[PDB]
Symmetry: D2
Amino acid sequence: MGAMKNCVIVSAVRTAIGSFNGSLASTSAIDLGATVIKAAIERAKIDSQHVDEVIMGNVLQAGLGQNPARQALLKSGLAETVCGFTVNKVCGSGLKSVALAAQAIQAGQAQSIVAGGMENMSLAPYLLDAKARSGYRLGDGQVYDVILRDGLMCATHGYHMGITAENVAKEYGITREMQDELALHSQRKAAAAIESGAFTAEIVPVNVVTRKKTFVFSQDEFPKANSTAEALGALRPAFDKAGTVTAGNASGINDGAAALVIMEESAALAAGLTPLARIKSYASGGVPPALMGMGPVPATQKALQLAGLQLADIDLIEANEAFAAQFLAVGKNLGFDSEKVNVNGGAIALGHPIGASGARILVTLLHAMQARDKTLGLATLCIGGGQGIAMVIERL
Amino acid sequence: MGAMKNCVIVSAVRTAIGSFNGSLASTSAIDLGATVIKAAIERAKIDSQHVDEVIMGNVLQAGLGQNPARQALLKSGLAETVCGFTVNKVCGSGLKSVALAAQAIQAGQAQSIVAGGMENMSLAPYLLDAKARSGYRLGDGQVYDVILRDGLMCATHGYHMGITAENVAKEYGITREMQDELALHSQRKAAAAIESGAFTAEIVPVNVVTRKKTFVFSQDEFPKANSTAEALGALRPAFDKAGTVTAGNASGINDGAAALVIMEESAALAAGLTPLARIKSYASGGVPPALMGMGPVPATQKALQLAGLQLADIDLIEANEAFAAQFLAVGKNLGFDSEKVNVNGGAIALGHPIGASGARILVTLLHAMQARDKTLGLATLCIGGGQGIAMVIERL
Amino acid sequence: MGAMKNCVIVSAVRTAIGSFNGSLASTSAIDLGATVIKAAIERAKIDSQHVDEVIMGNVLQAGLGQNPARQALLKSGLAETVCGFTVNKVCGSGLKSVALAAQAIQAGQAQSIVAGGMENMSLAPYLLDAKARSGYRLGDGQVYDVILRDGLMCATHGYHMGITAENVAKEYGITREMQDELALHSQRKAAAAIESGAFTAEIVPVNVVTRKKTFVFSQDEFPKANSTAEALGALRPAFDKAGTVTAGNASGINDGAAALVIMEESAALAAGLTPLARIKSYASGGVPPALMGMGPVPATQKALQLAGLQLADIDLIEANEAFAAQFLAVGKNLGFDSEKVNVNGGAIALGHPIGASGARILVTLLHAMQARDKTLGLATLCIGGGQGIAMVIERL
Amino acid sequence: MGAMKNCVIVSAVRTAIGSFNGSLASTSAIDLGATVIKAAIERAKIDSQHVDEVIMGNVLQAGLGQNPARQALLKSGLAETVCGFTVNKVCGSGLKSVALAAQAIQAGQAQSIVAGGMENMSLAPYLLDAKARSGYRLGDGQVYDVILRDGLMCATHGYHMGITAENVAKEYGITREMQDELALHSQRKAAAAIESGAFTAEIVPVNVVTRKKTFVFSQDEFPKANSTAEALGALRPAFDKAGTVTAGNASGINDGAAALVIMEESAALAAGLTPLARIKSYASGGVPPALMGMGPVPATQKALQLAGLQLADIDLIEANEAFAAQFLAVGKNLGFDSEKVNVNGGAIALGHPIGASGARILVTLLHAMQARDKTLGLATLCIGGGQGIAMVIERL
């Protein structure tokens, strides 16, 4: 039988993250993906004719046309002979795409892949029912927000992700005040990272050209400057009248992309490129949809166990902040050393472009590891529908 | 470094394929997908607790809710700890899912996976523009058919897959007469198969209940009974008033699903199960979007090479019949022996539910191989956006 | 001061009435209008250049373009110098248009007017909310059935005209049996009148060209052949599950038009044309929206008073059958002699194209009066929003 | 045979005119209508129980519900026994409504009517095709802006009212510079009228109540303070690149209502109320659709002949400024003394809520006549689809 191969990250880049109807609200998911795919390739210094595949996560595919991943790879300038496909694992899509690239490389089926995710929630459409096709006939119908139907509502329970967060908050006893405390801490870490230029290396600018003008978008815009504990404690519950989750202790609706060049190790070295990290393990884990926020627990355990590691071995962790409730409960459950976690801020401040986040956090992890000279890293996140995904990387 | 593993198919099953607004038009893609997932598991006789993952292709995801593959798996009865995700490689999606399943198994990542695809084109929705979200403000807008926008129009050139078929007809000299003759051949072989019970083993019945009456769908309904050369000869071109492509020499818009249980070889034997074929290789290839019908050429060339085989080594072949124009160009380019191709009929008679067709043709191939006691088989198909995928299987 | 003039009907024509999605479902309200306008002019023998105005009732104006009455007159072949406007008094609109034409002639403001009404309920559109113009932003919306929103739901209470009919049933002790008995009688009279050629004189045929083919629509299609007291008594209530109103004891949703030439008496004589009747009086009356079915009471009372008449002086009556419940309550309230009412059947059998019905009953009244050589006629109907209108005509 | 009666205006009121998406954008046309109906009755000091009818113009009736005039009337607090109906003569609706009230009163069918118009263009909906009712089936559709379909595009020619304006400019040689000079002059006269309080008497405040804001709207907000020749001359043409017509020399899309109490003269005196003016005559005229802007020519000539007057007899004139090109063509053709026309500014400055404008200009004329102590007044305006309407009043 063949022998498994080692797989390395050779570059990692992301766009800044746009606010809902903000700076990226006229730049399609596919143009955001093309942008990062191109920049990833440039930064890796790889010969672009040697890219075997592109794998991109994208959750709100409605109306974006055939195979958005292929559209993005073509717009990036890659050759027509470079194949690609679009991954939908909801919030995990962007990391799952990276895991699939690693898997294909490790299994000898390719040598170089560009993998990540992309999402423009601002541009998500509205949907008419199949009933529109066959005819309404008589009586009113419904117009469906696609963000909600395909991206933020649980298809098992018909209620918002928010409510799964509340469920996790009751089950693990995570209080309103614990959530807001975390939220402020994420905002402060983000604000220092942004100010001190910690994200400069990882961000590729996007040129936004409009009828009125052209401008360059290169700074995360979702952070809420000058956030305070009292402002946060003043907010009303978003999803439950008697609830704990608010707009201030939850991530948002956001736009952005991220991509990495993944390569077989001995081929990266023979081509005279510089490996930035090895992909050591990855795993997916499943939980009840009602408690989807806990997905990272089984995923993280499997990934650790597949790497031959203990959690305490890990130097830096990016655990996604879709809701402070789920992020705290996961952290409580596994016993995270929280000073190793989301050291430059997390999604409550930075935003959550769902199909891109999984890859975005991996980008942020690797650059934080390089800046602080750390060796071992963990990226994980919860996934709508009751799943989680995790990946461990080791710096070179 | 780990040793790679062998992957085997342990069951293979499909629904009968529904005509547009036909027998399956009220059964959701997700329910079709659950039916085949459950049936594949039952037929395999595998303990359902041993399923590691479910991978399903699905192209018109718009409005189907979070992660359709995960919904299907939960509906099929699998536990909530079973992970899954949804693949979009357009027409290729369903075979790509099986290829990914086999890769995970080969790589030691999983031991048992259900993979395939599912599509209900009848139930595809209509889409309002992003403008609807931000506001039309003044002036009209458009309401978009999702079938066309995400499934049948080229996102590169903005025209129908029918036009790519016309481009391929010119390039390779495939005339209307040539196209019509293949169409009749296909209708004929499909009718003989139906008549002889050749599809009985592979089809899982779907119960369709409506208040007026409840009925069992178990027979492909797209085939045109009593098709003739004369009748085909009289149709008007569908896409190009001076063209060669018609509704009679192209597949249709259809509903259906297919799935297979795939396992690590030794896990199959340890569970006392009966391997039906080994997956020998698989590959993807890219061609210009304008000539997407030619996708099978580079995919087949790569997959034969990976398998260490020549085209002449293959005993039976399933090459999808999206359009006779591209089916014929492909067979001419590669030198297929046409008596080994689509022996029970192809998509011009059977139908093309896009997300599913790739797994559908593989199911059909395996059963055909079993019926004829053949050893080596190839499944391949073109993909909108200019791709191709192929897989070689070897009977056991 | 000038003195009031006398006004006479010179012609009276209607289309046959179409069922919902029936024979007239692809002929625009405006084309129906033009047909009857043109025909009324031909049958009156008036010089087309002498038409001073066209007044047409039309309730579902949405999407029909500027001033439907004006579009209809232009299509009819009248000169661009002939003015026109569109009236909306809901169910009254068609009779209101005639009353206005008569008032204008009586007041010396014009000599010849064509008036009536037109509706194509089958072609009525659906509406997105103003929120579409501003933008949905986030969250679901509705898509509104214009028939219901602008035609059939009470704008004061938000419930169906249906419910106003249940209200009246109660207020006046009108049982399900009494309603179904009336319904059966209407169906018999109408089938009898159609069989016997009673509508031949008043109906102008419509040429309906479909993509495939052409036919002539000239016979009322809503009547229900072989209606029986038992089938009717078997029906489920349509609007309240403890209710009395059914699809069998109410009119339907329908397509059609009607028009009449009205002239100043002395100018009709000077042109050598034959007055068919004199418009003796007209009136409108108001009642609670909840009891809109009773509108005919004050309208009829006032109209008789303005005509110097008592109910008993009237030889023939057309009292619209929107709902048997209100038609019976009106009849009981006023003491109708039922043998004189709706002698050729009413709307329960014939249909209710709401904009046209007011003119349609008047057309049917005049022709019945001619065939039975009667002298005094009354036409009245109820109007959604709590109104009624009535007109008294005197044959000559 | 009775004798014709005299009709007087007893009150005249309007809302301030809102800009598109401006201060009135959240207030329904019906509410605007109710507001002016109530205020008119209050100003007249009439006993509300003496009101026989309400007749209101309204052009974009789509989705507004049954019989908007009836709704407004009920909303105003009038008794349910008061009938009303809604008029559509496009831009002319509001003045047509007053003419119809006058006609009814002259002809002795009523003694007190409230008449006017109402429009909220900001809240006009979007519409799906009849195809939505029967089903799109396959292929795209359109979503239609009601403002355009029912209110601003020619139903005969399918192009914007602005194009009819270009037709008129070319026909009558009305240059860009002539049009821009008129626009400036109307802006100045409006600014001067606002500065000196000339609108205070005629305007009734509307209370606008939003969660976001609460405030009283009482001042016209479409006029452009500090308009200049140079700014007007720099604007691009709006409807045609070689065109003359711009946003600066055409009226806007606007929201407003206006209404007047009308009464039989002797009943007025008997009631101890003060007649403000006598309605002396009214007429409608027709012209080709393509040249709709010229409609006021035949309407005015008939109105004058019917009143026994020469143009020069008229002391003050309100000729609607839908487009500068049409307004000037009209004045050239009739030889208007411009010093007497639109003395407080016209629609280029004040706006054009289409169903209300015909009433609005009448209210404006009356009050200006009072301020300047003038005796004869003329109100006229052009109408989409190729009509005009005019009215002559005589101050008392």
